[PDB]
Symmetry: D2
């Protein structure tokens, strides 16, 4: 019964109350995290504010040295961290060891990306002849206190993808780990503390969302909100932030537009590997298949073979399909499956449940009226939608409320490029599954998938402030 604590002003501290964390696999007690109160969150913010000056008065290479030390420690304990993460959010054990390794690679790259940030030296001579002697030296300064709110699916990766870009840029970071996955956020904080990050530069906040979860967002000391989660909470954040800068990475129903000339075997393998990784619990996952009618049958057969080869089971057996995060999540996904079945959709895959453990349901004949065609299941369902033309596929893709990513499988790259130009998404992948990619590529969503563009350089550039210094050079 481990009693994990909160990093606050460089000291590990606990709270009077604590939240118990149960495995989504078998409800094993993983430990407890403190249930902070509003005054505790307030004092963590005031520690951050006090640590900010000396942190941004450091040279970039020094902050990067701290970051590199953190990444080394994180890679050192990749199995300790990986096991706890694997039982905390019920993801495959190699998938959970893989997240820690990808995390360390991400913060190494962010440390090295954020010490190469170059300003501009602009002159007014090109705009007007009267300002020919004026020189603006434009650079970037930290926004201040960055508040990072991590999601459950990648509690170590999508938390470090906010902490490391903010830290190298000179900001202090306040981390809010998810409700499920908070022990992993505290373990990330342990790696940061072991590195030697100065007191107050990185603080953690754990608690009930009904007590401090709004209080930390509307706090006056917070200068930037970096949030990954679902679109409802993201829309609430966008209004609770006022006009303070935010980065929201919300839900996505990513389409796989498959056309007649698509190499269907590769398309099916990629579509299934994208759709069912972490049992569908990914924002950047293939969440619908929009296939043309002429190849829809063969694509459905290949998709069925791929989805039948998926091993459902328990995280430590390295199952492709592990239990979903909550019972409420399984109930919501089950409702989507029920609604599809009631409207005469062809479930060409066993449709059975075992509590949290759902089965990789591949549906066909999915129409506009089924909720599985629009709602993000965040679980193991994959709709197949048949369209008559490319225009119908593009209209179906752009009918979604989400614009995160999309895949276009073709053989004609000129055709794929103009479809990609037509798709109202942030990223289009040509003949590949949709993903966050190398975390040096831009990662952004549109209409409902969030605000701002991520990617390591884009995240460093987003939690900074432009400061122009203008003088005369005669």
């Amino acid at each position: 019964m481990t009693r994990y604590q909160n990093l606050v002003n460089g000291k590990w501290k606990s709270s009077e109350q604590e939240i118990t964390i149960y495995s989504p696999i078998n409800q094993e007690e993983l430990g407890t995290v403190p249930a902070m109160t509003q005054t505790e969150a307030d004092e963590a913010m005031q520690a951050a504010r006090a640590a900010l000056p000396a942190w941004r008065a450091l040279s970039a290479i020094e902050r990067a040295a701290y970051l590199h030390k953190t990444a080394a420690i994180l890679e050192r304990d990749k199995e300790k961290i990986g096991t706890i993460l694997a039982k905390e959010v019920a993801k495959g054990i190699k998938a959970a060891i893989g997240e820690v390794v990808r995390t360390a690679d991400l913060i190494r790259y962010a440390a090295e990306e954020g010490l190469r940030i170059t300003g501009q030296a602009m002159e007014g001579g090109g705009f007007e002849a009267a300002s020919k002697n004026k020189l603006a030296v434009v650079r970037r300064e930290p926004v201040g206190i960055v508040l990072a709110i991590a999601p459950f699916n990648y509690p170590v990766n999508l938390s470090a993808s906010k902490i490391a870009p903010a830290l190298i840029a000179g900001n202090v970071v306040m981390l809010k780990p998810p409700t499920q996955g908070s022990i992993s956020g505290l373990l990330l904080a342990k790696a940061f503390e072991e590195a030697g990050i100065p007191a107050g530069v990185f603080n953690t906040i754990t608690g009930r969302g009904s007590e401090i979860g709004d209080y930390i967002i509307e706090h006056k000391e917070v200068n930037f909100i970096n949030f990954t989660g679902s679109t409802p909470i993201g829309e609430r954040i966008g209004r609770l932030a006022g006009m303070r800068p935010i980065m929201l990475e919300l839900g996505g129903k990513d389409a796989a537009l498959v056309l007649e000339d698509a190499d269907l075997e590769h398309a099916a393998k990629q579509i299934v590997a994208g759709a069912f990784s972490y049992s569908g619990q990914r924002c950047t996952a293939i969440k619908r298949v929009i296939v043309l009618e002429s190849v829809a049958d063969k694509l459905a057969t290949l998709l069925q073979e791929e989805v039948s080869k998926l091993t459902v089971g328990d995280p430590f057996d390295n199952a492709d399909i592990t239990p979903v995060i909550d019972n409420a999540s399984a109930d919501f996904i089950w409702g989507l499956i029920e609604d599809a079945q009631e409207k005469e959709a062809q479930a060409l895959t066993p449709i059975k449940r075992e509590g949290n453990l759902l089965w990789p349901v591949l549906f066909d004949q999915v129409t506009k009226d089924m909720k599985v065609a629009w709602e993000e299941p965040f679980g193991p369902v994959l709709p197949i939608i048949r369209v008559a033309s490319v225009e119908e596929a593009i209209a179906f893709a752009n009918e979604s409320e989400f614009g995160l990513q999309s895949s276009v499988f073709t053989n004609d790259f000129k055709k794929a490029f103009e479809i990609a130009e037509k798709l109202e998404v942030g990223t289009v992948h040509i003949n590949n599954k949709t993903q966050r990619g190398p975390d040096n590529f831009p990662f952004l969503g549109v209409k409902g998938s969030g605000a701002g563009v991520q990617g390591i350089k884009y995240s460093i550039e987003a939690m900074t402030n432009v400061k122009s210094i203008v003088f005369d050079v005669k």
Copy 2:
């Protein structure tokens, strides 16, 4: 009795109701502008949404051609537009003609800068050996319908600085000209219509702010709100926009920090020219002087002479101090002046009201308890605040709720650079007054002066969406 109309879907439209516009100089009826209803706003947004795809299907050079045409036409009617915008916001006629010519120059520069927006080609390898031979082609696409809300002080320049950067990027623009200054917004729309801009690409919205003011901000067709105005209204817009991208350019109490080793004559001339241009109704004006005690008396004397050389009167006489925009504005300035003089501030110039026409009040011995050290007047009042140290000056400057711009007057540029690093503003000017400047320069506020970075390149970038395309 000119009945100005609204550009919607290329055609000119009027409404049943009408707002009447009176000069802040002598209250003459300048004309009337339509008071659109929420349904008419909706139709303007639908015209915009239908015009968007053919506008971004146009090549960049083809849209820049329209922008250059509009700038040439607008410079053609520099005197006609200038007189109307002079008597509409009580701006000096040589400054109102200058606003139009600088507007034309901004549209030219925006066209030619939005021609050259180049994307990236990232390679994946270098972050992972697995993602080697994945190529991301990163480019920018228009956000969609850009809603621009212009301020009264520059109805033509600060509406074009939202329209032209958005239009060149591929967006369609829905302009919301201010209440005082709506006629100049339609005079700017006249140029866009004359220069063959396609239907629905540029539309104008005029009406009472209690009928369509929130209806247009909250509309779902709006994809970007570009707003210039006051901090209360901007803070309201910030929440009303949701997670839609916004550009807010709110107020600012720009400080003029003067040190002991500083050319006081140059500093005084710059401080007064900045502070009292358009009689203080500028977001980027010197709105407070923070001088060190040793040079405070010499600077006060020099500042007083500079203020005394100011001409107060009528815009068409090219006065330095024309009347403020409204009576409520003058009452608010007069309240600040009263609060200051009822607290023993040394008024160094003759406090004198004549209706809207206020007088260039220069105050001294201003402390933190007077509400003129903190509140942005938007009128002809300059507080001198004396501090004992450079640290005291920086703390006083950073105590403001605004962070737009600031000036540091000294002779040690290394000292000025250090102070500029410490100042929580967007732009620091060393040994010059604050200004929006060369409009290619970044223009931004922090802390409460706004959200986002303006300046033409930054404006074009802000109203676009990154569109990555990854392949093998």
Copy 3:
């Protein structure tokens, strides 16, 4: 008999000796240009060196104003300059006025692009913690005097492409027009002087190569040599320039790699349009077809139909095949054609020669021993080369000594991209012919095809010097 004059120090200057220029189409006469002596070249160089300080002192928008005025005057006298151009180099009057118009467009774009050249404000904190208070403001200064040597092909376009990028960046320009199309260069100077560009900012130096050819290149006043022409002369310039910066745009042997999946009709049309534009006298024209065996016969038939549809005549009938520039050119192309004939290459189109007027020769079954497979003809002859594999095509394309551009005609863009990365050229066009393209695109050659990157942005950057100013900010 029009006695054209050299623009020197704002004044029109003539010489004791004048070179006479005759029409390549009928040897008529067009006028004379001053054959300057070396002292005259010195006075032009000194005029430029004295004009340099006040031209640099100008604001960028003020320098751009002259450029825009020149562009307007050029677009005004489009038909006059065009007629003299089509007379000078036998180009085709609708393709000669097009050169004048594309030249004014280039000048406008160069002015507007040079307005926006922004510097860097680099900090040392990312590299070391001891330099964290040092700021480098890095901007670009003019090199000084730029010597632009134009070719006969495009004597106002490939001349403006050196003058305008140089002028907008603050340099003063020496223009050495081609010995043949010099009258067109003096017309360009007429336009620049009419715009009102200051005295000594743009001068022209005509003459005989044996007197002032190496003389102006070796002058110590010249700070940059921008030369486009033939590869041997380019090598001589590369030696003669010492360590002074140069930009050489030399010959090319651009290949059209045609694979089996290619759309052969599009390939044939693109290849013929690229290859026979201006009678093959372009460095960026297609100059050899490298085609796989399977589709080679169908491609050759399509290519033959395209070639035997080209108009051969005089420039004022707007012929696609107008006479080559001089008699030595026609003799060299005829020699290549003969060498191909004796080694049993299949002439797919008639082999005719009416003096300078050559007929377009499509040669099939061309092998590595015929010299038309390697040498740049600068004449209307295109060899088709058959290869058995994609690797054979890449080996044959990279066997050339030239590296300017190439086309890959394919249907698989992934394959086309792989081949493009394998081709040793500056630019690869996928399913299109080679061109200088939009002039904002980079234009460069590799191994034997030149030195430096052209394109308006790259040309502006090439003829400037980085000037870094480093100071403490704390």
Copy 4:
């Protein structure tokens, strides 16, 4: 008595003959170096040509892993390499060890900088409406084989500054160590080979310039020459290169312009620290004090006491003034001192000579007639030159045939910026000594002082070719 060998194709080689290398400190023999022949140089070039298309095919992060391994090994053996370097080139032991760790974190920065080189995605629609659908994907490809020639000055630092920016860019490198400092080049090769660098990727050439000196520069395998030496040999190289790209870092005569408002104590300290570091044997050292007559006497006294407190002796006692590299250098420097004192220059510090070890000479009343005012001594001689105005100082500064770096000591920064923009140098330091600076900063000479822009990013981009791939998106 160690016999060092040449890294060729992953193997160590002696040739038949060996150049024996002696310590410039006394004469102590420290080893021999293979006197390679033209044939062996050819085999090394061919090994590099064969290793190229596997190093290119590697990922940027893998090539960077090799670079980081080399940097780690280099810091592991900093004292052994440093001691050998200090006796090899006669610099203080703490300064020879300090260019081994400065070299290692030059190598780290080079790798981290080279693995985020981004390309462009240019569209043609801004230039013309006919090319709106053309997209250029502009990326950078390795130049090929890089020839790096190091100077004796920094045989490790000024060698890695060419190797690492090359190797990270994907192109293989051949290193020619200086004749005096060959041991250090082979010691750096030892670290590169120990790191695991693939065979043929990093080779080393030693021998006699009369045998293999022009032979390697003129070799057709070489695609880029990166040379830092003296202006004569750089003039030869710029000619022998042809049109092959080169980077030349030649000599300098950096001036410290001191005006009347200047802080004279700071100027006096900075000037001596910059001028006499490594016995004045740096290209970027201060070699000229140009001071206004009002403050010239006070400056001269401060400078004299600054120079007098320097220590002259042995490198292992960490003398500030260690002996110059060879006897020819001491003869030339003594000739400069001679010419100065015959023409009635006022020696402010004693002039001495102990064969190779000279004493630092502060010369006042230096005029444009003494050779010490114009020639680069590469020895501990600093001439003070008095001028009557700032315009006279700028005229004297620009009178030099060198354009590398310059210092302006002022108190008015607007004045210092004015003068800096007037100065014909590559870098101007305001109120600080000239230096190569943080190596991320641009480093260049703009006169007969060099060709090309160095600095880690600038040298990475110099030894690459732009490759544009243009296709239609439509």
